[PDB]
Structure formats: structure tokens, C-alpha cells
Amino acid sequence: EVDTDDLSNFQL
Amino acid sequence: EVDTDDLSNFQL
Amino acid sequence: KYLVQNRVTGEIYESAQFLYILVAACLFSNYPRETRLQYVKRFYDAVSTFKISLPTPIMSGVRTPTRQFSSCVLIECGDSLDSINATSSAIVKYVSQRAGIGINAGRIRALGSPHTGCIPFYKHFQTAVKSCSQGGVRGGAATLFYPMWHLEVESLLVLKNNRGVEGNRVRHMDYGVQINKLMYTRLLKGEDITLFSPSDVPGLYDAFFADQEEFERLYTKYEKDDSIRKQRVKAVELFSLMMQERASTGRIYIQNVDHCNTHSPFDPAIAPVRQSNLCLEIALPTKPLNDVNDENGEIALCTLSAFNLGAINNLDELEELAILAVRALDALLDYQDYPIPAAKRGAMGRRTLGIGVINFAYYLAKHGKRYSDGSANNLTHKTFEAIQYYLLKASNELAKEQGACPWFNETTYAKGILPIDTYKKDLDTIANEPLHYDWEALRESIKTHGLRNSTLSALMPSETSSQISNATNGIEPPRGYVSIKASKDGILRQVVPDYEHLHDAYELLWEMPGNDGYLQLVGIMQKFIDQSISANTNYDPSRFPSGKVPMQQLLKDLLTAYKFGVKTLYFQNTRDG
Amino acid sequence: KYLVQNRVTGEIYESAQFLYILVAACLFSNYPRETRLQYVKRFYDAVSTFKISLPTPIMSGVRTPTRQFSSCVLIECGDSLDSINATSSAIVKYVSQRAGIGINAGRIRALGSPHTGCIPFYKHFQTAVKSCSQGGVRGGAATLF
Amino acid sequence: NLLVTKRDGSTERINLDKIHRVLDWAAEGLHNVSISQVELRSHIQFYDGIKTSDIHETIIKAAADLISRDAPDYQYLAARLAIFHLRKKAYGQFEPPALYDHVVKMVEMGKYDNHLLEDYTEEEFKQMDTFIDHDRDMTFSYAAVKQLEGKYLVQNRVTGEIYESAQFLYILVAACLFSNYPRETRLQYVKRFYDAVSTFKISLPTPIMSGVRTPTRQFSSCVLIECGDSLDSINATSSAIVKYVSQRAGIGINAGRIRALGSPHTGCIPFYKHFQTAVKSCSQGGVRGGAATLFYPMWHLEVESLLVLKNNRGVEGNRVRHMDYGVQINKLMYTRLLKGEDITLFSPSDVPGLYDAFFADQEEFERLYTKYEKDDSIRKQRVKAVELFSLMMQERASTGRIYIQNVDHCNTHSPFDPAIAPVRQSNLCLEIALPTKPLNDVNDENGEIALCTLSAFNLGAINNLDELEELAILAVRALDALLDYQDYPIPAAKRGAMGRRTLGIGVINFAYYLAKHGKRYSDGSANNLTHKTFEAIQYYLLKASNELAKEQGACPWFNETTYAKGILPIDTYKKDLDTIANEPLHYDWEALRESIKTHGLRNSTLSALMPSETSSQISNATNGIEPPRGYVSIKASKDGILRQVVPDYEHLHDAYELLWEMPGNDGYLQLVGIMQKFIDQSISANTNYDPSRFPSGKVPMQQLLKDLLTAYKFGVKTLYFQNTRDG
Question: What domain count does chain E have?
């Protein structure tokens, strides 16, 4: 199971 | 599984 | 299991010292007044101080009103319903006394012989062995024997296999595969083994035990003669089957029938040895029975004892210990009763003893040797020369005093042939201790007055005898330093003798790199031992690639055993995890 | 299962009427000369015309060199190892002739009696009954009481 | 007493002291070994009239069994005893024959290729024999010898006899590869290479080591084949796969172009299954040997079926279990995941120009992609980017072999102009990244099949970074020579080879090197040294290739490289790398840049970091860039358990960071990203997880995805196995 909320913070 | 080739070397 | 006690109420009536003194007093109850209390005192001392051990029936029974003290019998079955019945009957009578059974059953003719064959009868021998047990499953054990070349052998070898059909399996007895030189040679020469029903090959079965030369002749003939029903199998395949069932069950045993007869106290031509007992240390003559009471059967029994090698201060103590031990056992032979007349005959005819050792590993530890490295070969040689000599000596002067056993004349001993004349030669390549005693003075004395006893020495396993003396079990190295059993009083722990000073001196079973050292020691023991030795092979899977023991290895150790003249091979142990 | 025949090769040697006449001739072989062929004739007739039937061993065997014709026995077992053995031995001998067995075994004392009880011995009577059978499973039957 | 069966039949008294003397010789120089221990162990196994061969393998094995981390030199005792045996087995004495004499016999027997005698004169051999040091056979570790004896040394496979010894293998490998050189330099190059290999500075792939100098001309260990969307191509691919797995090549199959189920028909999976039987056609009982990794884009319409292709519980038509998979991914897709949005699935056949752009031009991909999503005449399927990723991540996790290719990183940071010669797939183990063209038919002269010509520097055998110059000359030259030496079953293979002369040279022993410079994987403590080390490798490599172009001409298609355009690895690497290391470049990339533009490169690619298994056991070295799982490593063999202790365990046990003591994956991934900066192709990079390090023993999807992201952020091209400890 995943939290997309902190995911988004990431810089590619 | 067996090797009969060295077997034969044996002295009884 | 020793002390006289009420089994219902649970009260205990004696204490150990009385057990000992009273065991001694009964066994020597017959002696002349002059020597009697002198012999009693001396034996009591040997036993109370653990120099000599005795079998459980003897220790719990002698001095009580019973006259049954038997712990194992050998019965040979002829190829007839009369004999089959007789055997079965004799088995019932014996397992009912909780004797361990050794059944030679190889004479029974094969399936299809002019009919239904071995297995249905084996099954019958099994219910017999189980007739006075538990819920029909627990207590009373038997080892049943057949030659390797028996026509049915491929069915027989898998008799203990889990996955079979019901008629295919006779799972609650152990088996002893009988093997001679010729067969091995077929394996090494990568050739065939021929399977014959005994009934179809006159004189072959007999010769198998008594005369190898003749076996080789009759064998090669019958293979050729193709009027005779036969079956050929690949010697590798056949051996592999035997080796893997042995491996998986831990209890398909091996008897080298040539070694049991060329290196026997019996003239193979008169009184061959063609089987063993339940644990493969007993090697004595047997005759089939016509009927339970056939006065011409021979049932061999095991009269057992042991020297505590750890309690002797040095090897010469074994002289008076050997006098005590042999005498007490000989006296018991007359004291006890015989359910079956064929039993009585063997006992009275040949007065056969099996005295062995306990505490061997401890002894080895404290002389700073080990099993695995060869470091003990010589000390072993010295120790067993000492045992056999002192034993034979004790029996010799007993014959002087009381007459050789009735059938002493069927011994190689009567012919001046000694253990030291007929042992397997390759033994010279692995030890070189000189004999320290005068085997020639003894030789001559034997020829002159004979032996009171036809056999004197056998190396049995012990479990109970050795716990009571706090000793390692017979010739076995200990699995670990502390050993555990269950009981309904909690866990019973026992630490190895002198662990404090000897922990690094022991070679615990599983630290032996392999089996060779041990087998060499067993071969060296065999040199002097009249009967046989409960020898084990062990394997730790975690010591081999991918955890599996290779058939190559299993077979090399089988070969090593034979090469060093090893008579029987008992359990194969396989560590787990 | 009646006609004399080679069991290997499979050839048949007699025909039913001879079986019948010869069964009769053997069974009445002892009679006085006066009545004998008169009894033989009469029995042959009763059997060839199905008035009387006879058990298979009798029909297949009588007139051949065998002297075993038994199809069932009753054996009573006493409460002793001697008897237990004896019974067992007698069972072997009989199932070996393909007799059907009847075993009275009720006298054997119970588990716990001053010991291991009936069942281990029954099991033994069973291997006995099965000793000359098939693959140790098929043929030779018994009823135990 | 005791007798002994001699080599043929004769029987002498057991010479106990000959044995002992051999052991004392073998134990010479070593430490912590007991000779008597070995003797007691092996003597007890001797029987009257035992074969002479058996006396040997017994003492050998007795030594082998004592190999431990407390007594590492048992691996050397065993080695030397084994070496001595193998000498007598091949030569009937320890003393090997002269080179010439040996080679001559060997051609008589048809075990060496007789062009060796053709290309060199008798004192050309006489000379090379003075190059040889048969004493170096003493430097091998027991595991290494078992490898040599198992799969390098020329030997009869039936009878089992061994014909050469390791030094000849080395000298003769060198002599063949340099057989073409001008007389002036030739024995000078031969001597030098022999030295580099006999002293473990350079490793070479197994086919090359076992084959070169024998009559074969096949030495290939892996190929890449791209499959077009046609039965002709499907067939062709399949045919090419058969031919290659039949040579035991590892296969890389790009299969993403094949159109989806329902397209105007039965779709991918039945064809994959076919590629699988192809890959398995010359294997075992149809199951064991010959492996392949097959590739597709993430957005392929069938992708949800494809990702579960290795799943245990499925139906038969649902599963193609005996190949690995490489999911191809670009920036856009990740962005959909983080932005918590949708991913659209399209059959390739239904979206012109999209597939192409996926690899060659992200900007255009983004355009064509957003368009087609909107255009709703086009067959599509939408999926939740989290869901889709999760599926991929969990199959990767459960099977350990669903791989990831970042197709943007393989093309923006490539030696190839993506617009001319895109990289659109990898090989079996994800270190190879080179251009491929579909085939019309097995013999289509316009296909391109990429193959991997491999080698490696032993970072543990170099005394310092500048040794890599002459090592890089040796290595690049020998590989370039092999390119011409070997043959090509398929013409499309030949074209790639001859067109772009592509090399993949990498490293072994990295962890050991790191240990001995007192760094670790997990803490960042190595980022700079790594940066320094791989700048050194790439520079010296490119330099070696540069002067080879001067000497022999740039590769035919050098013009499709970014290299031809003066673009260098150091110009196009992923930027965030600046945030994790800061070693300055120590070499003159600008002098080199200019030299490249002028004379070109002999080779289009020079560097790839492969895994090694066999190469590194032979040098007693840690495997490529991997940290060791433990200090002693075990294999089965039908000679017992082979143990090998890590290099210099005695002095380095605390300096190693064993695989499972790494707190997580970041340090490692940073080092891989930093490596990637200079590496032409790609790196077999792993992710590892120890469940016992997470709550209730389960690795959370959050974590799996963060590491996937970290990988991308640092410009990581591919991702190979995921390891999961057990217990």
C-alpha cells in the first residue's frame, strides 16, 4: 500500500 | 549415481 | 528396571548393593565350599565397582523366583510349513519373554516355485514378533536375514519402504542382507548378479556360508545351466537399491557371510554361522526345527556381559575380571530354564558366551586418542588382544576344572586354530602392535583341555548397562557431551565421564570427518572377537555437496568394511538439519 | 475348475461324464461286489442329471492322486501360547490346502489380565490365514468368533 | 606395509615420504596450515593397492575441506596440490614441456588450431616460452583451479583427460589475438597481454578463455535481437535465437513492437511463448540452460498481462515463465506516478511515431503521447499510475526478475545519436546498451544484431589508477582483434560488429578495492573515490581506442556516435550527480575531446559493467561491483564443497561491508549513478532487501518505489535482479 502524497515531493 | 570406473580399482 | 519392586503399588524393596551381592550369591551358589564365598566376594566387588556390566534381565531377575533371563535368540527357518510353523511358535514363546529375535529366513523358496513365496510368511513372522506387544505395535523387535542373491531380493530390500501397497510391505522388522566376496567382485567388475530361488540350486545355499570356492563353482555353473530358473540384475543397481533402503530407513543391515565363517570359532563345514541376532553382534550355529519341540533344532541365545574399559587401571586387571565374568556366565547357563528344547541344546552343546566392552570412547579419550585419524589402531589392537587372551585363558582352565563344552569338537579351537590364525590379512596394513601374550602356550593348553565355552567375546551395544556405570556406550563415540532422555519424572541429563578434564579429548560422533577410522578400529577389534560387533556407519548430510550423501561414498564404506574383515554392519545414522 | 487339465500347458484331459462316473467309482470303490456297480451306476445318474451337487474340491480332485478334499475347518483356540501357536499352525496347514477357516478365539483373556490381550494374537491368526495367498492379500478367508 | 597402483598397472610400496615432500612444497610460504592435519585426514582413507590418481585427489580434497576464514591459506595449499596433480595429468610430470613442443603435439591431436604454428616460427615460440612463468600457477586459489579445470583448460570431455595448464592457456590466448600485428610490435604486445592476464589485471569471458587457440571461431556470450511487427521478423528473430542459444549465447529480445491482442490479432503472448521454446531449444531436458530477457515499453496495451508472465498461479496461456522481462520506462511515466495520475496503454500499431520517439526524443514523445490520449478515435486503455507501477514492482519483488530500463537515460546519456541509432533494449543481464535493427529474414543483410565483446579490469590488482593506461591499451586492442578473429552465424550480427566495433569492458573486485581504501557502499563514503576511479577507466579506455583509430581507422559507422560530434560522457551525464560527488576531473578531457573529433574512435562503445562469476573466482576477487554476501562463499561440485575466502580477509574483515549489513539501497545506487557517468553502456545494478529489517517482515511498496525513483534521479540506465534475503 502507498501514500501518493509524499511521493509527489520527489524531484526527478 | 555411481562411477564403476574407480570402483574397480579397489582391493577386497 | 533393576531393583526388585512392586509393579502395582510402586514400592521399592531392595537397594543396589543387595542386588549385586545377591546376583553374585546365586550365580556362585553351586561352587565348592572352599572357593564359593571367595568367588562371591570377588564378583560382588567387580560389579559394585562397575568393572563388569550385566544384561538387564540378569540384573533384575537373578535372585528372584524367575528362571527366564534371556534377551536374544537366533532361530533358523527351514523351507517347510512344519518349520515355518515351528519358527513362528518359537518366536511367540520368546517375544513373550521379551527376547529380541534373529530369524534366518533365506531358505524359504521364492514366489512361483513349483508357490506364493516369502513375503506372506515374513508378515507372519512379524505378527508373531508382535504378539505380546503394546497395542500390537510397540516392543519385541526382530531382524530377519536372507542372502543377496535370493530370487525375491528386490522385493525384500524395499520391505520397510513407506510408499508401497500392503502386501508389498512388512515394515516393523529390520533386515540383514547376506553377502559374500563373489557378489562384491561382481559390483567392482561392473557385472551381473544372478538371482536364484534356493529350492532350484542344490548345494549353493549351503556353500554360501561354509565354502566360498564351492560357492563360486556351483554359482558359475547354475548361471550357465539354463534349465534352472534364474533372474539377472546389474550388480551396481542391486547394491544401490540395498544401499538406499539402508540409508532411508537406517536399518537394512549387512552380513559378510564369508568373514563370519573363515574367521569363526566354528568349523564352517560342521556348524556354519548363517545369521545374526537383532543387533548383529551375535554370530553362532543354528539348526531348523521340525516342530516347536524338535529335539534336533538349534536355537542360539545370547549370554552377554561386558568389561568397563574405563574402570580398569590397566590391561592385566582383565585376567581376574575375565575369570569372574566367564565363570558367572557359565554358571547362569545351568541356572536358567529353556522354553524350547532346541534352545537348551545350543546352550548345553556349545556353552556360548558374548562378553564385550563398554566405555571404549572414554578410555580412548583418556589415552588421548581418537576414532577418526588412525591414532588408536595400535592401542585398540593391544586392548583386544588382552581381552581375547584373558577370556580364552579363563575358559581354558574352566574346561580343566569342569570339562570342555559337549560339542567343543566342532570348534576351530579344538583343531588348534586361533583367532590370530584366521583374521583378515589387510589388517596388517593398518596396525602393527606386536602380540604381547603367549598365544602359543595358550594354543597348546586349549588343544589339550579344550574350552569350557565355544565362544567368549561379542561386542554388543549397551544403553542401560552403560548409563548405570556412567560410561560411553560400548564402542560408540558419544553424540554430544550431555545426553537427554524423557521420563515421567522430568528430563534426565547425564554428562560424559570426566568431562571436566576430557572435553577436548573426546571425539564426539559428528566431528569424525568420516567413517574410515572407526571401521579400521572395528576391523581390528574383529581380529580377536569370536562373534561380531554392532558396528555403525554414520553420515552428516551437511558435510556433502547440496546435502546429499553420494552413493559412491555409501559403497566405498561398505567396501572398506569388507576389506578389513568386518562381519556385520548395524545401523546407519544420518544426522539431521 | 472341475476338469482334469494341465495347468501350465492349458490342455484339457477329461470330459464331464468321465468326471462324474469316476467320482462315483472312487467313492464306492470299497463296496461289496454285489452292490458296488449298482451303487456306482445310481450315484453317477444322480450327479450327471444334477439331482445332487458336490463341493469343488471333491469334483476336481476325487479320481486324481490327491487325498486332500477339504473346503472348511473349525479350530477352537485355548487361552495359552501353546494353543495359540497350535491354532496358528493348524491354520497354516489348512489355508495351504485352500480350506476356509472358522476360528473360535473368545477364550483368549482380555488386555490387562494378570496381558497385551486379544488383538495382537488375532492379527497373527490373520497372517496365518493369509500365509499362502496371492500377494499376501487375496485368497484364504476366515471368520473368527 | 600398503601398496599403490601406478599410472598404468604396475604396483609399488606406498611412498609415504614422496607424499609428505609434495605437501611441504605446497605448504611453502603459507600460514596457519597443518601438513599433518592434512595427512591424518587423507591417510586414513588409503587402502592397500589404491590408485595413484586417488592418493592425489584425496590429499587435495583433505586440504580443500580445511579451507576456512581462520585458515584461508588452505585455499592455497589445496590449489597447489591440485595444480601439481593437473601437471602430471597433462605432462606426466610437474615440469611442463617447452611451448613449441607442446603446441606441436597439440596440433597433432587437433586440440589447438594449427594457424598458431602457421603464424609463428619456432623461436617465435622459443621466445614466448621465456615470457612464460609457470610459477604463477601457484597464485591460483583452489576455487579458481576448480574453475580452470572445469571450464577453461583444453581437455577431453569424454575420457576426462586434461591437456594444457593455465600458463599456456594465457600465452596462447595472447598469441592468437595478436597473431596479426606487425612483426616489430607483435611479440611485444603478446608478452605484455600475457602478463596482464597471468597476473589477473585483466579478466576475460569464459568462451574466450576456453576457446581462443582452439579450432573454434565462435566465442559469443550474449546477443541483442530486435523483433519487428511481422511474421517474417518474428520468424527471423526466432531463427536467430535458435542459432545463438545453440552456441550457448545469452539472448536479449526486444519484442515491444509486436502489436496488441485484438489489433485488426491474437497478440504478443503466443509469440513470446515461441521465443521461449526457441531460447530453450538446445537445453537440458528443454528446461535448463540458455536464458533470455525480453523487453517491452511500460505503456504497451498488453502490459498488465505481460508483467505477470512469471507468476506461479496462472493458466497455461497466461504464463511464459522461463525468461526474464525488462519493463521500459521514461520520465513521463514516472511523472504520472508522482502526480498521482493515469498511464495510457496503446498498442504500438495504433499510434504512429510514438514508439520511435519513446527512445529517441522525449519532447516528441510527450507531444504524440498527450495528443493520442485525447484523440479518441484511437484504441486506448487507461490505468492508475500507482496501480500499474505496483503491479510491476510486486512481480519484480516476488520473482526477483522483472527488470527496469530507463529508456530516456539510455538515449540522452548514450554514445549514439538517438535519432540515427537509438538504444532500445538491453541484453540478458542489463549491462549492454547498443543499437539494433529488426530482420526481414534470418539472412536479411539490413538487420542489426548487437553482441557483447566483454572484458574487465581487476581493480584489486592495480597498484594505482595510472596502470589503467597500458591495461586499457592491452584490453581494447585484444578485444578489437577478436572482433575480426571470430565468425558470425548471422549476417546481421556481423554488421553491428563491423559497423561499430562495440566493446564492453568493466571491473571486478570493486568491493575489495573499496574495502582496502577503507570506504563502504552504504554511507556515501565512496562517492568521490568511485568518481575518480571511473573517470580514470573511461578516459584511459577512450584514449586507447583513439590511438587505435589513428593506427587502423575509426569504426565504419563511427559517424553515428555523439563522439563524432565532440560530445563526451562528461557532457551528457545526469545533473543531480553534482549533488552527490565533487571530485574534480583529473585528466584532460578537452585534449582527448579534440583528438576524438580528429581521428575518431576505433570502437563505438568501450565500457560496460557486467556481472562476473567465473572471471572473478579465478582471480580470487569480489564479483564486479557487488559487495560479497558473506566472507566465505560455498558452491556444490561433484568433488565436494568448494569454499573461497574473500581477498585479504585477514586484514580486511571489518573493512568490508557485506551485502546484508548495508542499512539500505541508497549508497549503492549513488555509486552506480556515479559509475554510469563515465560508462558507455550500462551496469548490472541490483536492489536488495532484507525483510527482517522492516515491520512485520514485509517490504513496503513505498520503499520499493522510492528506490526505483532514486535510481532514476541519479540517471541509472537499467536495474537488474532484486534480491530478498530469507529467514
Answer: 2
